[PDB]
């Protein structure tokens, strides 16, 4: 659980795409194929997304990569 | 010094048939308050008593009408009735019965005798006739409870028991009605000064203030008795058919016996592409299964979260 | 103006928005509206099943096929709906009904057959 | 309606003076809140000549503004949306901070939609409506 | 009853149309929770009369904004009503004043 | 006068009077003004205009629900409200809102779909007031069409 | 006071601290018991001679 | 600056045939002529304040041109001139509905618009 | 739906009816019940919400457990008057409102009709949390002060419990500073007690 | 069930340190609520077994306000440092302690002198912060076994806190358990100063409170 998204903010900084890459990150969790690296207290993927993504461990390189090596190894 | 004293119950005074003022002489200094305001509104937020429930009327059907023979219709009849204070004894519901016939009015104490009901208040009018052949003849179900229910909760309460003819009002099942208290200097010298509070009450007259003082001191311990220790430091899938009578054709019950198949659970999970990787079972087994499973099944359309064995 | 003609549904619309709602494949779906659109609003279907097999264009796709896509409809808002030939509607209604039930046994076997001489 | 942000920097050097407002008896505001929501210009010198206070590109995040009123500076160069140097919106060095963010404006916003609206949002106004000096100071 | 009070709030519930007043107020006979009869004195009555009124009360009839009108009576049993008296009192009324 | 009426019923001449707590059991420091005032109901109440809907009627023109209290109807979302999101960001909320919901007759139904599924996600498609819209301009001596 | 503290300490403590303030605002506003009466208003005595 | 735009010139600048054009247009023609072959052949502009009321005409996208005045006129204008919206303004993306530039979606557009040359 | 108060409430919930409710989540409290099971068809789902079994109110606390949702007023000059926030179930048919950001929709609490609009997209629920959300937006976007500031009775109590006396009960004694507390539940002190020595950190 | 009122089932109560306590309840009976609170925290708070320092007999002047002798510290931040000093007697009366130490420079609790009968919760616990090495200071200090919150102006030099918790509030939400959806939630928050648990000192609040009344309720349950 998390109310303000100051936390997550600094780390992108532009705050404009926030919600894009949140986006795509909450629509794999949604759909079904990947699992969350940070551990669920019970809550929605809308707000698991931002609390990974206010760790560091997600953003909009990583999803990038992490696409591209998906994809090369299919 | 540890066990300072303990409250004793004495000196009870009964003013009238409501007021009665029940006083605690011996207590320690800072209790007075916390005891006098925690023994109010316990006594003035639950309190077992009787009140009516229900009454059905021979001749009027429903409240929104009038009748002959009386001088109000049946609207404040109901309202007299919710505050006729009344002790039941032995048993919980009573379904006392209330007939007349004349020129006079009708009070609480011309009503059918019964061993158990007691009426305390004779004197309380319940409608005026002003015909000569005015008749009035009733039945009033009266029980027991704690707080204030309306009628609206029990609508719903009783499934299909409303026959045509018997209206519901709203219960009190608060007997008290008027509770207070004050503190003052009590008269003991001899140890250190104290002082007594003194609990003040106008009630509706059905139940006793030395016995609804015990009732709620016994509520409050009980209440307590959780605080004494702390800690000492179904919900599931319908489909739960077995395998069989799923008309088997061909393989069926060799696919569902060698794959480990559940009994009905595990095949509606399943998808009709993943299917066809199992080994060759045939497309009209495939549609057999379809076909059966279209009234059981039901075209094996679901995705579960978890299956428990 | 007025030009707040407020629509509806009934048993076409109706029939149609449940066919969505399950898990139909693309041509499971297809073949949904050509039988959910020959049923007669009055009760059942008006042609025969035969003739929606006819009425897909092919040739790899049987009654069997079919029969499923049809026997699923069965069930949907109006238990009954898209029958054909009497029999089968009043069949399906006591299917779903509890197993426990008196009359249940006897009911089904009067169902079957012998019914010209109950409509006597 | 039409204004976007598109741009990160607009890239001039014409900006604007800006003073305190003083009408006959007093000053109403003093230059305390009219800069410091927007970015200050290059020409941003000490009251001593040869020293400089603040660089070209400067936000004043209420840290600088408390020096500016100690040393008592009374013209402060500062840009505004006057620039001609965009082709289509405004840049975001220019606006400034004046959000409820706090830190500087992102590419995306539109100020064209939250002012004419900012200042629309109070509908409480009314309808229809030599020779002696004396001051206070001196 | 407003306890507060105003002014000439019996008169404002008098002349609002929606209570019964007894013309030629004589002598009350029979109450009823509808129907309300009164025997007129041998002075306020003219020959060729029996020499009774009769009142029907209102119970529960419909408004225009879906309000039930409801009357009620005011005398019990054989109590003297002179002439411009109100008998009934309706909606929103206490024994013959406004209460709102 | 007032004041020697209250006198009068045994009371405090000033009004005030010193009340108790009927929650942690304590005494107001302030006295604070005892009294039976009036009171009038009115005709504005929650149980007549509160109202709720996700899916139910639509018109004929432009595919729009209702707006008054039918069965079930909505309210109209004005440029005041559009406004106020255009200065957030609501593009997506706003492109969900002014389609999906209103107008699009098989995006409505899609999203009520893949809200059933699960699957939560979005297809613009095209409203149907642009074409009512265009039938109405290719009504008169005017041409107008949508190009690539 | 509410200003300096978004200002110095961020935005979480502020939303943490306005919400307590208004918890304990209310609190003591019941607590309190004004109330506004007859008496708490007085004319001044010289105001029928300035008249 | 909306209410200092539509600039008015007295040079010809390639465009003698026009009085009173609007300042972006103007401003980046010079900005590609003074730099590319040479900026003799210039237009000196004197900016003219204009009317709020009489500005919000001025709007390449017909199609957000009619809510905003007389319907059928700007409708008329558009028959007689011909020309195009693109789909430029926000109101625009409004009235289609499409995904606007505002906040977020902004982006979209800007990749929208920037890999617009390949296809 | 009716606004009425809750001082109960924090920053960023709203008190929504349970009546409201089960009519404007029902696509996706029937997706609940279809996973769960306890659905096996549309209708089956349809027939238990049209019942209003003891189930159906488990499954909509489950789904609007961190569900955004946003409010709004028909009058709505600024921003400020759209925001978003966290609903909570309350028994009733009126909506509950933070006495905080009811100067943002500039109320007088003798309550007007609203609006209650729910996202449905994932996106749509970004954006309500990351930007509508009241707990981001403080400060006005017209002059850049703090418009989340109390109102009359906690500026009222404030004053009170924040005041001087010349003679109060009890007064001159020192204080550590977290023992005021115990001495205002009993009679030892005064709130208004001053020239009263205690240290603070 | 009139005479069968609903009890919480569970008892969540968890401390963030060795002296914290939030303990959190389950939903009772609608009503008890603040009731039960207040009286727990009256009964916590107004009067509690307990002892503290009464006085100090200190070598110098009598006065409450005398010269700093070269210490550094003030003699009234001297008197209210002295109060917050935890003292367990296991059965001893009122007992005087002293203490004397040179200038090593903070003067802490372990300074005073070893009894069998007085312990000390922290002898970190600082009581003089500067001293110029030169003289000694004693303190010859005095506890008393005592109930409750005596101030010094009715007492008639140093308060006395008998009282062992520190701080104490509650308060009171919602919680549902079926359709009803109205029931009473109490939330207990506190801070001890030492010698007692939390959850012990709530303990023996209930055990006095349940003992306070044991004779109006005629013995039920008999």
């Given at each position: 659980?998390?109310?303000?998204?100051?936390?997550?903010?600094?780390?992108?900084?532009?705050?404009?795409?926030?919600?894009?890459?949140?986006?795509?990150?909450?629509?794999?969790?949604?759909?079904?194929?990947?699992?969350?690296?940070?551990?669920?207290?019970?809550?929605?993927?809308?707000?698991?997304?931002?609390?990974?993504?206010?760790?560091?461990?997600?953003?909009?390189?990583?999803?990038?990569?992490?696409?591209?090596?998906?994809?090369?190894?299919? | 010094?540890?066990?300072?004293?303990?409250?004793?119950?004495?000196?009870?005074?009964?003013?009238?048939?409501?007021?009665?003022?029940?006083?605690?002489?011996?207590?320690?200094?800072?209790?007075?308050?916390?005891?006098?305001?925690?023994?109010?509104?316990?006594?003035?937020?639950?309190?077992?008593?009787?009140?009516?429930?229900?009454?059905?009327?021979?001749?009027?059907?429903?409240?929104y009408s009038t009748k002959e023979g009386v001088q109000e219709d049946i609207?404040?009849?109901?309202?007299?009735?919710?505050?006729?204070?009344?002790?039941?004894?032995?048993?919980?519901?009573?379904?006392?019965?209330?007939?007349?016939?004349?020129?006079?009015?009708?009070?609480?104490?011309?009503?059918?005798?019964?061993?158990?009901?007691?009426?305390?208040?004779?004197?309380?009018?319940?409608?005026?006739?002003?015909?000569?052949?005015?008749?009035?003849?009733?039945?009033?179900?009266?029980?027991?409870?704690?707080?204030?229910?309306?009628?609206?909760?029990?609508?719903?309460?009783?499934?299909?028991?409303?026959?045509?003819?018997?209206?519901?009002?709203?219960?009190?099942?608060?007997?008290?009605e008027r509770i207070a208290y004050n503190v003052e200097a009590a008269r003991?010298?001899?140890?250190?000064?104290?002082?007594?509070?003194?609990?003040?009450?106008?009630?509706?007259?059905?139940?006793?203030?030395?016995?609804?003082?015990?009732?709620?001191?016994?509520?409050?311990?009980?209440?307590?008795?959780?605080?004494?220790?702390?800690?000492?430091?179904?919900?599931?899938?319908?489909?739960?058919?077995?395998?069989?009578?799923?008309?088997?054709?061909?393989?069926?019950?060799?696919?569902?016996?060698?794959?480990?198949?559940?009994?009905?659970?595990?095949?509606?999970?399943?998808?009709?592409?993943?299917?066809?990787?199992?080994?060759?079972?045939?497309?009209?087994?495939?549609?057999?299964?379809?076909?059966?499973?279209?009234?059981?099944?039901?075209?094996?359309?679901?995705?579960?979260?978890?299956?428990?064995? | 103006?007025?030009?707040?003609?407020?629509?509806?549904?009934?048993?076409?619309?109706?029939?149609?928005?449940?066919?969505?709602?399950?898990?139909?494949?693309?041509?499971?779906?297809?073949?949904?509206?050509?039988?959910?659109?020959?049923?007669?609003?009055?009760?059942?279907?008006?042609?025969?099943?035969?003739?929606?097999?006819?009425?897909?264009?092919?040739?790899?796709?049987?009654?069997?096929?079919?029969?499923?896509?049809?026997?699923?409809?069965?069930?949907?808002?109006?238990?009954?709906?898209?029958?054909?030939?009497?029999?089968?509607?009043?069949?399906?209604?006591?299917?779903?009904?509890?197993?426990?039930?008196?009359?249940?046994?006897?009911?089904?076997?009067?169902?079957?057959?012998?019914?010209?001489?109950?409509?006597? | 309606?039409?204004?976007?942000?598109?741009?990160?920097?607009?890239?001039?050097?014409?900006?604007?003076?800006?003073?305190?407002?003083?009408?006959?008896?007093?000053?109403?505001?003093?230059?305390?809140?009219?800069?410091?929501?927007?970015?200050?210009?290059?020409?941003?010198?000490?009251?001593?000549?040869?020293?400089?206070?603040?660089?070209?590109?400067?936000?004043?995040?209420?840290?600088?503004?408390?020096?500016?009123?100690?040393?008592?500076?009374?013209?402060?160069?500062?840009?505004?949306?006057?620039?001609?140097?965009?082709?289509?919106?405004?840049?975001?060095?220019?606006?400034?901070?004046?959000?409820?963010?706090?830190?500087?404006?992102?590419?995306?916003?539109?100020?064209?939609?939250?002012?004419?609206?900012?200042?629309?949002?109070?509908?409480?106004?009314?309808?229809?409506?030599?020779?002696?000096?004396?001051?206070?100071?001196? | 009853?407003?306890?507060?009070?105003?002014?000439?709030?019996?008169?404002?519930?008098?002349?609002?149309?929606?209570?019964?007043?007894?013309?030629?107020?004589?002598?009350?006979?029979?109450?009823?929770?509808?129907?309300?009869?009164?025997?007129?004195?041998?002075?306020?009555?003219?020959?060729?009369?029996?020499?009774?009124?009769?009142?029907?009360?209102?119970?529960?009839?419909?408004?225009?904004?879906?309000?039930?009108?409801?009357?009620?009576?005011?005398?019990?049993?054989?109590?003297?009503?002179?002439?411009?008296?109100?008998?009934?009192?309706?909606?929103?009324?206490?024994?013959?004043?406004?209460?709102? | 006068?007032?004041?020697?009426?209250?006198?009068?019923?045994?009371?405090?001449?000033?009004?005030?009077?010193?009340?108790?707590?009927?929650?942690?059991?304590?005494?107001?420091?302030?006295?604070?003004?005892?009294?039976?005032?009036?009171?009038?109901?009115?005709?504005?109440?929650?149980?007549?205009?509160?109202?709720?809907?996700?899916?139910?009627?639509?018109?004929?023109?432009?595919?729009?629900?209702?707006?008054?209290?039918?069965?079930?109807?909505?309210?109209?979302?004005?440029?005041?409200?559009?406004?106020?999101?255009?200065?957030?960001?609501?593009?997506?909320?706003?492109?969900?809102?002014?389609?999906?919901?209103?107008?699009?007759?098989?995006?409505?139904?899609?999203?009520?779909?893949?809200?059933?599924?699960?699957?939560?996600?979005?297809?613009?498609?095209?409203?149907?007031?642009?074409?009512?819209?265009?039938?109405?301009?290719?009504?008169?001596?005017?041409?107008?069409?949508?190009?690539? | 006071?509410?200003?300096?503290?978004?200002?110095?300490?961020?935005?979480?403590?502020?939303?943490?601290?306005?919400?307590?303030?208004?918890?304990?605002?209310?609190?003591?506003?019941?607590?309190?018991?004004?109330?506004?009466?007859?008496?708490?208003?007085?004319?001044?005595?010289?105001?029928?001679?300035?008249? | 600056?909306?209410?200092?735009?539509?600039?008015?010139?007295?040079?010809?600048?390639?465009?003698?045939?026009?009085?009173?054009?609007?300042?972006?247009?103007?401003?980046?023609?010079?900005?590609?002529?003074?730099?590319?072959?040479?900026?003799?052949?210039?237009?000196?502009?004197?900016?003219?304040?204009?009317?709020?009321?009489?500005?919000?005409?001025?709007?390449?996208?017909?199609?957000?041109?009619?809510?905003?005045?007389?319907?059928?006129?700007?409708?008329?204008?558009?028959?007689?001139?011909?020309?195009?919206?693109?789909?430029?303004?926000?109101?625009?993306?409004?009235?289609?509905?499409?995904?606007?530039?505002?906040?977020?979606?902004?982006?979209?557009?800007?990749?929208?618009?920037?890999?617009?040359?390949?296809? | 739906?009716?606004?009425?108060?809750g001082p109960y409430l924090r920053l960023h919930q709203c008190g929504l009816?349970?009546?409201?409710?089960?009519?404007?989540?029902?696509?996706?409290?029937?997706?609940?019940?279809?996973?769960?099971?306890?659905?096996?068809?549309?209708?089956?789902?349809?027939?238990?919400?049209?019942?209003?079994?003891?189930?159906?109110?488990?499954?909509?606390?489950?789904?609007?457990?961190?569900?955004?949702?946003?409010?709004?007023?028909?009058?709505?000059?600024?921003?400020?008057?759209?925001?978003?926030?966290?609903?909570?179930?309350?028994?009733?048919?009126?909506?509950?409102?933070?006495?905080?950001?009811?100067?943002?929709?500039?109320?007088?609490?003798?309550?007007?009709?609203?609006?209650?609009?729910?996202?449905?997209?994932?996106?749509?629920?970004?954006?309500?949390?990351?930007?509508?959300?009241?707990?981001?937006?403080?400060?006005?976007?017209?002059?850049?002060?703090?418009?989340?500031?109390?109102?009359?009775?906690?500026?009222?109590?404030?004053?009170?419990?924040?005041?001087?006396?010349?003679?109060?009960?009890?007064?001159?004694?020192?204080?550590?500073?977290?023992?005021?507390?115990?001495?205002?539940?009993?009679?030892?002190?005064?709130?208004?007690?001053?020239?009263?020595?205690?240290?603070?950190?």
């Amino acid at each position: 659980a998390r109310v303000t998204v100051q936390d997550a903010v600094e780390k992108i900084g532009n705050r404009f795409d926030l919600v894009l890459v949140a986006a795509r990150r909450a629509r794999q969790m949604q759909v079904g194929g990947k699992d969350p690296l940070v551990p669920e207290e019970n809550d929605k993927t809308t707000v698991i997304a931002l609390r990974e993504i206010e760790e560091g461990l997600i953003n909009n390189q990583i999803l990038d990569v992490r696409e591209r090596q998906e994809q090369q190894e299919q | 010094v540890t066990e300072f004293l303990k409250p004793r119950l004495v000196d009870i005074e009964q003013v009238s048939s409501t007021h009665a003022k029940v006083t605690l002489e011996p207590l320690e200094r800072g209790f007075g308050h916390t005891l006098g305001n925690a023994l109010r509104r316990i006594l003035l937020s639950s309190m077992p008593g009787c009140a009516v429930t229900e009454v059905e009327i021979d001749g009027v059907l429903h409240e929104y009408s009038t009748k002959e023979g009386v001088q109000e219709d049946i609207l404040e009849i109901l309202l007299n009735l919710k505050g006729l204070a009344v002790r039941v004894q032995g048993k919980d519901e009573v379904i006392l019965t209330l007939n007349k016939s004349g020129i006079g009015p009708v009070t609480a104490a011309d009503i059918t005798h019964d061993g158990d009901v007691e009426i305390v208040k004779p004197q309380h009018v319940i409608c005026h006739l002003t015909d000569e052949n005015a008749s009035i003849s009733m039945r009033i179900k009266v029980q027991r409870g704690r707080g204030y229910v309306p009628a609206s909760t029990r609508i719903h309460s009783e499934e299909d028991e409303r026959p045509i003819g018997r209206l519901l009002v709203d219960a009190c099942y608060s007997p008290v009605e008027r509770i207070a208290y004050n503190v003052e200097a009590a008269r003991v010298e001899q140890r250190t000064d104290l002082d007594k509070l003194v609990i003040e009450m106008e009630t509706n007259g059905t139940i006793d203030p030395e016995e609804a003082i015990r009732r709620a001191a016994t509520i409050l311990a009980e209440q307590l008795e959780a605080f004494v220790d702390l800690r000492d430091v179904e919900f599931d899938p319908i489909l739960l058919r077995p395998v069989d009578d799923l008309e088997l054709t061909v393989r069926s019950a060799n696919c569902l016996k060698a794959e480990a198949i559940h009994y009905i659970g595990d095949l509606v999970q399943r998808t009709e592409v993943e299917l066809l990787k199992t080994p060759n079972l045939g497309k009209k087994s495939l549609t057999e299964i379809k076909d059966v499973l279209a009234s059981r099944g039901l075209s094996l359309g679901m995705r579960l979260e978890n299956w428990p064995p | 103006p007025v030009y707040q003609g407020e629509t509806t549904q009934t048993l076409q619309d109706y029939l149609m928005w449940q066919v969505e709602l399950t898990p139909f494949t693309d041509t499971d779906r297809a073949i949904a509206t050509s039988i959910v659109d020959a049923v007669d609003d009055t009760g059942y279907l008006t042609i025969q099943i035969e003739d929606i097999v006819d009425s897909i264009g092919d040739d790899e796709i049987g009654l069997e096929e079919v029969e499923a896509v049809l026997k699923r409809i069965q069930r949907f808002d109006p238990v009954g709906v898209a029958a054909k030939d009497l029999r089968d509607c009043l069949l399906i209604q006591l299917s779903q009904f509890a197993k426990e039930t008196p009359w249940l046994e006897e009911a089904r076997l009067i169902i079957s057959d012998h019914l010209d001489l109950l409509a006597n | 309606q039409d204004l976007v942000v598109t741009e990160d920097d607009c890239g001039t050097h014409e900006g604007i003076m800006m003073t305190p407002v003083i009408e006959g008896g007093d000053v109403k505001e003093p230059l305390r809140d009219r800069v410091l929501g927007r970015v200050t210009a290059e020409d941003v010198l000490k009251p001593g000549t040869a020293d400089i206070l603040v660089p070209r590109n400067t936000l004043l995040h209420e840290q600088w503004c408390d020096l500016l009123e100690e040393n008592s500076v009374d013209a402060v160069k500062v840009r505004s949306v006057v620039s001609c140097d965009t082709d289509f919106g405004v840049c975001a060095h220019c606006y400034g901070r004046d959000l409820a963010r706090g830190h500087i404006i992102n590419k995306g916003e539109a100020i064209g939609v939250i002012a004419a609206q900012s200042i629309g949002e109070p509908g409480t106004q009314l309808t229809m409506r030599e020779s002696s000096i004396q001051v206070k100071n001196k | 009853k407003p306890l507060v009070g105003t002014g000439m709030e019996r008169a404002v519930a008098v002349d609002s149309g929606v209570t019964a007043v007894a013309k030629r107020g004589g002598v009350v006979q029979y109450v009823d929770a509808s129907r309300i009869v009164i025997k007129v004195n041998e002075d306020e009555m003219y020959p060729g009369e029996a020499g009774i009124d009769i009142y029907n009360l209102t119970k529960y009839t419909r408004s225009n904004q879906n309000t039930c009108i409801n009357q009620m009576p005011c005398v019990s049993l054989g109590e003297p009503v002179e002439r411009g008296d109100v008998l009934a009192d309706g909606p929103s009324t206490d024994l013959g004043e406004l209460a709102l | 006068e007032i004041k020697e009426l209250l006198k009068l019923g045994d009371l405090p001449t000033s009004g005030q009077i010193r009340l108790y707590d009927g929650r942690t059991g304590e005494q107001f420091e302030r006295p604070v003004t005892v009294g039976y005032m009036y009171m009038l109901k009115l005709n504005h109440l929650v149980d007549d205009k509160m109202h709720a809907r996700s899916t139910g009627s639509y018109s004929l023109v432009t595919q729009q629900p209702l707006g008054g209290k039918a069965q079930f109807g909505g309210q109209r979302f004005g440029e005041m409200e559009v406004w106020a999101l255009e200065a957030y960001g609501a593009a997506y909320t706003l492109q969900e809102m002014l389609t999906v919901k209103s107008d699009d007759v098989n995006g409505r139904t899609k999203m009520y779909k893949n809200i059933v599924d699960g699957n939560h996600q979005m297809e613009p498609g095209m409203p149907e007031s642009f074409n009512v819209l265009l039938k109405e301009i290719r009504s008169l001596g005017i041409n107008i069409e949508l190009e690539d | 006071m509410l200003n300096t503290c978004y200002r110095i300490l961020g935005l979480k403590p502020t939303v943490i601290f306005a919400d307590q303030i208004m918890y304990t605002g209310f609190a003591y506003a019941a607590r309190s018991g004004a109330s506004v009466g007859i008496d708490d208003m007085v004319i001044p005595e010289k105001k029928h001679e300035i008249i | 600056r909306q209410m200092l735009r539509k600039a008015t010139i007295v040079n010809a600048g390639s465009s003698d045939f026009l009085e009173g054009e609007q300042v972006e247009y103007s401003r980046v023609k010079i900005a590609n002529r003074e730099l590319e072959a040479n900026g003799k052949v210039g237009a000196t502009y004197s900016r003219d304040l204009l009317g709020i009321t009489k500005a919000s005409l001025a709007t390449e996208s017909f199609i957000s041109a009619a809510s905003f005045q007389e319907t059928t006129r700007v409708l008329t204008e558009a028959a007689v001139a011909g020309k195009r919206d693109e789909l430029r303004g926000l109101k625009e993306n409004v009235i289609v509905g499409r995904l606007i530039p505002a906040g977020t979606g902004y982006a979209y557009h800007q990749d929208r618009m920037r890999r617009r040359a390949a296809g | 739906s009716v606004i009425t108060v809750g001082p109960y409430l924090r920053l960023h919930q709203c008190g929504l009816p349970k009546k409201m409710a089960l009519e404007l989540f029902k696509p996706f409290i029937y997706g609940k019940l279809e996973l769960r099971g306890l659905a096996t068809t549309i209708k089956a789902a349809k027939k238990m919400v049209e019942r209003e079994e003891a189930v159906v109110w488990d499954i909509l606390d489950e789904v609007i457990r961190e569900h955004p949702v946003l409010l709004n007023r028909a009058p709505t000059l600024h921003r400020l008057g759209i925001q978003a926030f966290e609903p909570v179930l309350i028994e009733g048919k009126a909506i509950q409102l933070h006495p905080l950001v009811c100067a943002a929709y500039n109320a007088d609490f003798d309550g007007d009709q609203m609006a209650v609009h729910v996202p449905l997209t994932l996106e749509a629920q970004l954006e309500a949390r990351a930007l509508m959300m009241s707990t981001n937006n403080i400060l006005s976007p017209a002059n850049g002060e703090p418009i989340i500031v109390p109102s009359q009775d906690v500026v009222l109590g404030l004053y009170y419990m924040t005041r001087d006396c010349v003679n109060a009960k009890g007064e001159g004694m020192v204080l550590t500073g977290p023992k005021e507390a115990e001495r205002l539940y009993r009679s030892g002190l005064a709130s208004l007690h001053a020239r009263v020595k205690v240290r603070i950190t």
